[model samples]
Each structure stands twice: as structure tokens, then as C-alpha cells.
Target: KVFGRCELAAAMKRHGLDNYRGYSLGNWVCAAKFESNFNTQATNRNTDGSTDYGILQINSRWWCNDGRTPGSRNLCNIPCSALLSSDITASVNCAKKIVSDGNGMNAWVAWRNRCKGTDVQAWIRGCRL
Candidate 1:
């Protein structure tokens, strides 16, 4: 599923993630934009041979089962494809677990490389809330 930025912001707010784990909704919005451009079906294979799945681009090596990726920890205990759904609840729940484990938003390299220290308001600028 494809979501516009504002629509995604509203969904995140509804999920009570506006300030979850000491991270703001703007942080998530910014991260998602960079990670998958709000495309729930997004997936990418990294140069390191691991794969990222879904909107938050959770990694197969540590987070979910991609089947094809060897040595996946499956910490989230869900299939990578589960994250690639129109319903983002599963994806968000897995993300919460990831943040709790460590690295916070830094778990996502896109968040570290792009969203961090940036003006995050633009990510939700036109959202109706």
C-alpha cells in the first residue's frame, strides 16, 4: 500500500506513536519517507547481503524472516512479508520492539544518514491530524 505523507502521519498518531520510546512522530515520518517513501511493499537487498522489508525497512538479518536470507535472527518472529501490508500495525509493533532493543531510530541507516538533525516538520507539514 502506498500512503501519502500526511495520511501516514495521521495513522502514526492514531497508533499512539507520536512520542513513543522518546522519539517523536516527526522522526518516524521522516524516517519512513526516506526508508520506503511510504510504500508498504518496499523491499531492498543490501550490499551486505541482508534484506530490508516494508515501510520501516526492518532488516531480515535481525528482525524478520525473509526465508531467502540466511542466518536471520527472526527477532520479531514474523515473516518479512507481514511488514509489507496495507495495515501498518504489525510493522509498527515490530518497530517498537526494535527501538526497545537498542539503537532507537538509529536502527535504520536511512534514519541515521538522512532524517537525523533534519527539519522533520516538513514530513508532516500538511497533515490534517
Candidate 2:
């Protein structure tokens, strides 16, 4: 399911991610925009052959199992499909874990490339959060 930017922001606010794990909501919003464009069902195959799953694009090699991938750490302990739901609870929880694992938003290449050290205030600009 794809979501509007404001909708995604509101959902993230409801999930208590406006200021989660020392990252701002703007950071998450920017990362999601670059990662999956707020498409809950988004998936992409990495150049290294791993698949990225869900809105935050958690990877099969370290966070979840896609079955087709081998040597997954599966730290999120969820099936890859779980992250694809319109209900974002599982994805959010797993994202929190990933951030807490020390990479922070650096865990996402999208964040590193597009969001890091940038002014992301526009990401949440008109949202009613």
C-alpha cells in the first residue's frame, strides 16, 4: 500500500517516531521517501543479491527472512512479508531495533546518501502532526 507523505508522517507520529531513538521525524520521513516512497509493499533486489523489504527497506541479509536469501541474521524475527502490510506496526518495531543496533539512520543507504547532514525540515513541513 502506498501512502501520501502527510499520511505517512501522521502514522509515524502515532507510532511515536516523531522523536524516536534520537532521530527526528524528519529523518525518518526523508529516509522513507528515498527508501520506498512510502510504499508499504516496496521491495528491491540489492546489487549484492539481498532483497530490501518494506517501507524502511529492511534487508534480507540482516533483518528479515525472505526465504530466497541465505545467511539472514533475521534480527527482526519476522517474515519479510510482514513488513509489506498496510499496517505498519511490524515494520516500525523492526526499524526501531535496527536503529538501536548502533547504525541509527545510517543503517539505510538512502538516509546516508539523501538525508544525512541535509536540512530535512521540509519532510514534515505541512503535516498536522
Candidate 3:
């Protein structure tokens, strides 16, 4: 079930957060919007002759040995291929783990506070999403 905005909102509610959290979805969405305009299939060229792919702009070298992206692996795994999969939401969730200990969004909260500002709520909600 590919989610649109309403469906994604429902999913977020089920996961324990509301539409706005100052961090997590808000910040992630903001970054994704700025970086790639929420294009899940986005890619970039690395300076080292490599490619960075997917919504979060993850580098391919972290996942593939042969450098050929396996969508299957990206679809359900983490710390690597998740960035290349069609599932941007799941990929974001997976990234949360690498940032912290499976805390995922919680880690996003801490990160936002440190890197951005304490009141990131405004920035997050302001994102076009």
C-alpha cells in the first residue's frame, strides 16, 4: 500500500507521533524536501566516482559489494540498502537505528536539538512535505 499524505498521517499516528513532532517526521521531511524534494528514487554523484541513491541520499558503497543495488535487499533490510528501496518511510526508520540504538525517531529529536535548534517544531511544520 503506497501511502499518500492522509494515509501517511494515519501511519504516523499509529506509530505514536502526531502530525508534528518538532523533529522526526518534521525534520526528516524537511531535510528530504530540501535535499531531494521527497523524491524517493533520487540519486547523486559522489566525488570518489561513486553514486549516492534514494530519498535520504544514501551512498551505495555502504550496502553493495559489487555496487549493483538490489532493490530486494533495500526493500526490507537496514544500515545499507534501505536507502535504495522504494519504501522511503521504512528507510527513514532504518536510518534511525544507525543513528542511535533502535530509538530511531527519538534519536532524531536529540539530533535536531543539537544540530539545529531547540524549537525545531516550527521548522518541521513549515516543511511542504
Candidate 4:
């Protein structure tokens, strides 16, 4: 499920991401745009053998247990597959935990490298969330 801008906003808004952890909806939407292009089934394997999963691209090494990332922490207490659901609840929940861990949105490289200083509202302009 590749979400359109408003679609993703509505979804995240349902899960309280509009202002979760003091981050704006635009920050999240922008990260998702670059991280996974809003694709629920997206996966990216990192050079360190960790795989990022789902729309927000949650990583296997720390957030989810994939049974492959060498030193899996599974801090989110979920199987890696859980993040792939189009429902997005799991992804957003885990993402909140990541934020609470003191990294803020910087836990995601996509957000830091791409969304950090940009006009993020463009990602959710007419989303109406």
C-alpha cells in the first residue's frame, strides 16, 4: 500500500503522530516519503546486514527482530514482519518508542539527511490533518 499524502497523514493522525513526541506531522510525513515512499511493503537492507521495514522503514537491528541482524535488540518487542502491515499502527507505535528513546526524529537517517531543514509542510500541505 503506497499512501498518498493525505492518506498517510490521516493514518498517522489516527495514531497521534500529528504531534507525537513534539514532532510535527510534516516531519513524519517527510520521513515516510523519503524512507519508504509511503510503501507499506518496502524493505531496505543495509550494508551492516540490518534491514529496514515498512512505511517508516523501522530497522531490524534495534526496533524489530528479523532473526538476521547480527545483534538484534528487538526493542520494539515485535517481529520484523509486523512493521509491513498497511495498517501502520505498529509502525507508528514503534516509531514513538524510538522517539522517546532520546534520539527524537533523528533516529531516522532519512529524516536527518532529507527532511531536517527543508520545508516539511510540503509533505502534508493539503493532507488536511
Q: Estimate each model's TM-score.
A: 0.94, 0.96, 0.51, 0.96
Best by TM-score: 4
> How accurate locally, in lDDT, is each candidate?
0.89, 0.90, 0.46, 0.91
Model 1, span 22-102: residue lDDT tens: 888999998999899999999999887888988899998988888877776999999989999999998999999998886
**Each candidate structure's count of clashing pairs:** 0, 0, 0, 0
What digit string (tens of lDDT, one per residue) describes model 2 on residues 1-129? 998998998998899887898888989899999999999999999987889988999898988888888666788999989999999998999999989998788899889999999998789998898
TM-score, cand. 2 vs. native = 0.96
Off-target runs (Cα >4 Å) in candidate 4 are: none
lDDT of 3 by residue, 1-129 (tens): 233443443344445444333245545544444444456666677666555555555545443222454432332244444455655555555444444444444433334444354443544453344
Candidate whose lDDT is highest: 4
Off by over 4 Å in 2: none
Q: List candidate 3 stretches off by more than 4 Å.
A: 1-23, 63-85, 101-115, 123-129
Candidate 4 residue lDDT tens string, 1-129: 889988898889889998888888999999999999999899999989999999999999899999988867999999989999978989999999999998899999989999999999888887676
RMSD of each: 1.1, 0.9, 6.7, 0.9
